Amino acid sequence: NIPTLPQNDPRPEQRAQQLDKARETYKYADLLPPLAFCEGVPKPDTPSAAWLVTVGKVAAAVALNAVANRRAWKRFDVGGTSEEDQNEAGHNSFLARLEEPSVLDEVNERVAAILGAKPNRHVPPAQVSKDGPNGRPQSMDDYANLFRRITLPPIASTWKNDSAFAAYRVAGPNASMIQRITELPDNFAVTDAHYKQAMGEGDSLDAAKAEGRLFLADWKLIGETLVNNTYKGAQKTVYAPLALFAVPPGGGSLAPVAIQPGQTPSPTNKIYATQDGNDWLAAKSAVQVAEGNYHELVSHLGLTHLLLEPIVMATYRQLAQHHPIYMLLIPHFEGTLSINNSAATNLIAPGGAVDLIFAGTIESEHQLALAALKRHDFMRSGLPDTIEQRGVGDTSVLTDYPYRDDGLKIWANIERWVTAYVNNYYISEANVTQDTELQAWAAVLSKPFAEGGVSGFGPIDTRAALIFACTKVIFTASAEHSAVNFPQKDLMSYAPAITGAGWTAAPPSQGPLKDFQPPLELAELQAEFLYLLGGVHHTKLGFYNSNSFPYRAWFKDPKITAELLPAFQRDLAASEELIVAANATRTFKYTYMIPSTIPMSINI
Amino acid sequence: NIPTLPQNDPRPEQRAQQLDKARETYKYADLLPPLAFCEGVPKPDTPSAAWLVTVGKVAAAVA
């Protein structure tokens, strides 16, 4: 078959009848206000068997670590529970390979209990707990010892170094935060003395501001939207810090200069610098807490999951199965509906993992997420555009920016493959306007953000405009989500390195480090649920197949099958070697933009 | 037992561990909007039996 535009289609009546049945299987829900959600999971978007088995094995290890953590506390129920989880691990690898009682029910339920922070996730079908790790830490060893049957992340041993703190701003979960500044803001007056502490006497703050070597990360939005909460009556705290970063003259890696935990300078809110010791380590730890709230809601959930959800909805509804753009975008949406529902009713739901671990009240977190979707500008949110919007573009000034360098490759790949796919099917700029399905598609997306649209979406009246919207979508389904989702397992499992709440007051430190860390019962949940969200690489960018049992190729037009997609896949195999090359020379690794590791869609 | 200020307390650790267990017992609520309220009546702050007997005599005459 050759997909075709609606005006060129030889059988328009059968086409508009498939969209009628399509709009009945994909109806809009209000699982989260403002946004445009789907009513449950339509059976087409059910998780594939391949996906369930992969997730099932991760949920098994997470469960076995929780049992092993329960053996350590109270130093048969732990033994019997240990084996029913082993039975599932053997059931998964063997029974599911037949190719759904063991696959369907057990996997979805185990994921729900991990993301929902439900009690007694020890054993399934065998139906805070003081027989598991809970309460205040005796020592900092209690946090590293929680990773018993899952591997402790490497940042658990590097995070105190200032080098690791700045690597987050270029190769961490929120690698898009910094911004080149020419003059310091008025509420963050850092001195030349603070600069010469970090960079030495050979450089001056004035010289760095002139040569574009100063970059700032400003968590002002956290202050605008969050409301501190409590856990079991214990005060959870979050800040809205500003942190300064500079590169040595002549170019080089980033390095932290100064930190101010609050938006407003005050007697209780001052500027901490590289030499201040225990106080400085807490001012970095405060920023890390701000990034956790900001990443998981803004960077991660708001601007990938929740950003693509109305587009996933409009694509099914207005674009027929015989539409070429429909053939391009649906495989980049596999399971996005399914994971966003498991996110809505479990993760960010009251009583879930984010409600307890992260500092804000759960509804204040939602406002933070919605605040970014409301201010986002889709048409000017292309990766090469955002790089030049921030002033982070010079490859010689700031030289260690893995996300920028690896990502700008994957973007160029996807744009080439999109520009090819579009130019084949859209042979005249009159094909775009007369695409009644694509214009309906653009309408429901061009709508106000309050009515359920994507901010800054219009207009899609050009082949170049459709090319961008299809590049940005594919990028968000693949590369960007890799750059944010998987750092959760590698860079966010260890609570002392970064977590959702501060558990003492402030960077002005008043005692031991272990008191700023979360209680163990939550610290175990953070490691486990972030292990699960970061430990599933299923489906691979460039490899378009079906979500059904044969897992056969998805395209049918032999133009794409034996030319256009192979052109795409080679470019990705090429960029992979350039990225793998640069990654060996790097101490702070960045696998999240490696073409082999990237998924097609948002699915975990 | 002679009371003592925190900085002078010979047993600071045991002291701090008490307020944690205490902040667990006395949690805030929004029973009345814009006011700092207690989440129900915690058990150590249950009305005493003397208070109930005195009140019970009055609540009987009213009935």
Side-chain angles (χ1 to χ4, degrees):
Chain A
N1 191 42
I2 293 182
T4 185
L5 308 184
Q7 66 272 43
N8 299 339
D9 199 311
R11 303 156 212 244
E13 204 64 66
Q14 189 194 40
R15 194 190 178 106
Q17 284 178 23
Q18 178 268 321
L19 284 176
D20 264 68
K21 183 189 164 60
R23 285 183 293 268
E24 295 175 355
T25 16
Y26 299 94
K27 295 179 176 180
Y28 280 101
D30 296 323
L31 302 177
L32 207 55
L35 283 197
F37 253 79
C38 205
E39 285 186 359
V41 169
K43 172 59 190 169
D45 280 65
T46 235
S48 74
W51 184 91
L52 291 170
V53 184
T54 305
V55 177
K57 301 180 180 177
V58 190
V62 154
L64 297 167
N65 179 80
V67 184
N69 265 309
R70 286 171 50 86
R71 285 198 197 107
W73 239 255
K74 275 287 199 63
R75 7 124 66 90
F76 212 9
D77 183 75
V78 274
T81 285
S82 171
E83 235 47 48
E84 309 182 56
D85 297 316
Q86 297 282 4
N87 168 78
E88 205 239 0
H91 246 209
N92 256 1
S93 54
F94 234 103
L95 196 162
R97 214 152 44 193
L98 267 51
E99 293 280 2
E100 309 171 354
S102 181
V103 225
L104 190 59
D105 181 48
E106 276 241 19
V107 174
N108 285 308
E109 181 177 2
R110 287 169 169 271
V111 175
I114 298 168
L115 304 185
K118 303 302 294 182
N120 308 336
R121 347 141 203 162
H122 318 146
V123 68
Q127 214 273 342
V128 65
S129 174
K130 246 221 66 65
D131 269 24
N134 64 84
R136 291 317 293 180
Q138 289 194 27
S139 57
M140 296 281 304
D141 306 29
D142 303 6
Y143 296 92
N145 269 329
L146 294 183
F147 298 74
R148 305 195 183 271
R149 303 279 285 276
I150 59 183
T151 314
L152 177 73
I155 195 51
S157 322
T158 332
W159 74 267
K160 309 201 189 187
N161 296 331
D162 285 341
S163 81
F165 173 73
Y168 271 74
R169 289 74 216 67
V170 287
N174 177 14
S176 333
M177 199 56 161
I178 52 182
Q179 160 109 31
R180 195 177 57 198
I181 54 168
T182 16
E183 229 298 294
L184 279 169
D186 290 334
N187 54 329
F188 193 26
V190 353
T191 71
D192 187 21
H194 299 137
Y195 188 72
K196 290 172 117 53
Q197 289 179 37
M199 304 284 87
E201 252 68 10
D203 194 13
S204 175
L205 185 90
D206 310 333
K209 92 180 62 174
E211 300 146 34
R213 287 190 286 110
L214 277 176
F215 307 92
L216 163 74
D218 190 358
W219 286 265
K220 176 182 180 177
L221 191 65
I222 298 276
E224 301 181 48
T225 54
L226 252 58
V227 173
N228 315 62
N229 205 6
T230 57
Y231 175 79
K232 301 225 270 71
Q235 182 62 56
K236 305 162 58 195
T237 322
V238 70
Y239 281 110
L242 305 91
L244 194 49
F245 293 90
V247 287
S253 283
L254 213 58
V257 176
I259 292 181
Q260 178 185 287
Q263 289 302 312
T264 306
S266 90
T268 113
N269 199 265
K270 246 311 262 67
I271 299 168
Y272 300 87
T274 34
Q275 307 294 330
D276 307 9
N278 280 344
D279 265 4
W280 164 258
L281 199 59
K284 294 193 310 154
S285 242
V287 172
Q288 295 292 95
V289 164
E291 192 77 301
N293 283 241
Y294 192 92
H295 159 264
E296 196 72 50
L297 285 125
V298 186
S299 278
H300 183 211
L301 283 184
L303 294 179
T304 64
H305 293 250
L306 297 189
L307 187 60
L308 294 179
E309 177 100 337
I311 300 179
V312 177
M313 275 309 297
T315 307
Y316 279 118
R317 290 192 116 243
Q318 310 306 275
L319 295 184
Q321 295 168 203
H322 291 165
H323 194 283
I325 301 297
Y326 176 97
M327 292 296 292
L328 169 74
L329 297 189
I330 294 303
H332 288 287
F333 293 154
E334 172 178 349
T336 302
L337 294 183
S338 186
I339 198 57
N340 289 350
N341 183 81
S342 199
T345 90
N346 261 309
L347 194 63
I348 60 170
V354 191
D355 196 353
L356 311 177
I357 297 172
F358 294 68
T361 66
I362 184 55
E363 42 261 334
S364 67
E365 300 281 42
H366 293 204
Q367 292 295 294
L368 166 72
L370 306 162
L373 286 158
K374 196 164 160 189
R375 83 176 186 184
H376 203 237
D377 187 358
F378 199 101
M379 241 42 195
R380 280 185 60 88
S381 71
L383 178 61
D385 195 354
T386 69
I387 293 306
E388 88 181 8
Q389 283 172 52
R390 279 139 58 192
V392 302
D394 202 325
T395 344
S396 278
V397 179
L398 174 48
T399 78
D400 176 51
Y401 205 163
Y403 163 92
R404 169 198 68 188
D405 294 322
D406 296 2
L408 277 174
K409 303 187 194 305
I410 318 295
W411 181 271
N413 291 149
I414 286 174
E415 185 180 297
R416 190 169 311 107
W417 151 248
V418 158
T419 298
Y421 193 108
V422 171
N423 280 330
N424 172 28
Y425 287 106
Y426 287 84
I427 56 106
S428 44
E429 292 277 341
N431 267 3
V432 193
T433 76
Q434 303 169 12
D435 192 335
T436 60
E437 292 185 357
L438 185 74
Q439 295 303 336
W441 181 77
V444 347
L445 295 185
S446 292
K447 285 217 298 180
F449 172 77
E451 299 183 7
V454 174
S455 302
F457 192 92
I460 313 293
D461 40 25
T462 315
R463 291 186 277 179
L466 173 61
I467 279 170
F468 176 87
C470 291
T471 302
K472 173 66 175 193
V473 159
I474 289 180
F475 195 82
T476 307
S478 50
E480 190 89 39
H481 186 248
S482 172
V484 298
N485 172 239
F486 300 103
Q488 286 164 342
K489 180 201 158 199
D490 296 339
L491 284 170
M492 298 174 67
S493 320
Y494 197 56
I498 174 174
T499 176
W503 296 82
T504 63
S509 173
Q510 22 191 355
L513 174 70
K514 74 180 191 303
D515 293 326
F516 179 83
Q517 257 54 247
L520 301 170
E521 11 116 74
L522 301 191
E524 184 186 0
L525 177 69
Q526 169 185 8
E528 282 160 356
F529 102 90
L530 287 182
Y531 200 87
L532 182 67
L533 290 181
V536 174
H537 295 256
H538 172 254
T539 219
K540 311 265 129 283
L541 180 55
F543 299 103
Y544 296 62
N545 306 279
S546 59
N547 58 4
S548 308
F549 142 72
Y551 297 108
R552 247 46 172 168
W554 213 70
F555 286 117
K556 294 295 162 49
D557 186 356
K559 180 71 179 182
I560 299 154
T561 291
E563 180 177 332
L564 261 41
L565 181 57
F568 184 28
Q569 296 180 334
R570 293 188 291 263
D571 283 20
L572 288 176
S575 280
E576 177 160 10
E577 187 161 338
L578 284 340
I579 290 168
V580 154
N583 226 47
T585 90
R586 290 197 276 249
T587 71
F588 215 92
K589 329 295 291 186
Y590 205 68
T591 31
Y592 312 127
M593 287 283 184
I594 294 186
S596 78
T597 47
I598 309 175
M600 291 273 303
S601 70
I602 298 177
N603 64 89
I604 252 289
Chain B
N1 187 25
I2 292 184
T4 169
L5 303 181
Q7 73 257 46
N8 299 339
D9 193 302
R11 257 146 277 198
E13 186 76 15
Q14 178 188 33
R15 182 187 180 99
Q17 293 192 352
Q18 181 251 305
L19 293 192
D20 286 331
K21 179 134 199 52
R23 283 181 287 263
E24 242 168 355
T25 308
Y26 297 85
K27 298 188 223 181
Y28 279 102
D30 271 0
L31 290 178
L32 216 63
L35 265 182
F37 231 95
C38 187
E39 214 208 72
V41 179
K43 201 58 191 184
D45 272 50
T46 293
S48 62
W51 182 89
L52 295 163
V53 164
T54 292
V55 169
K57 299 181 186 180
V58 177
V62 142

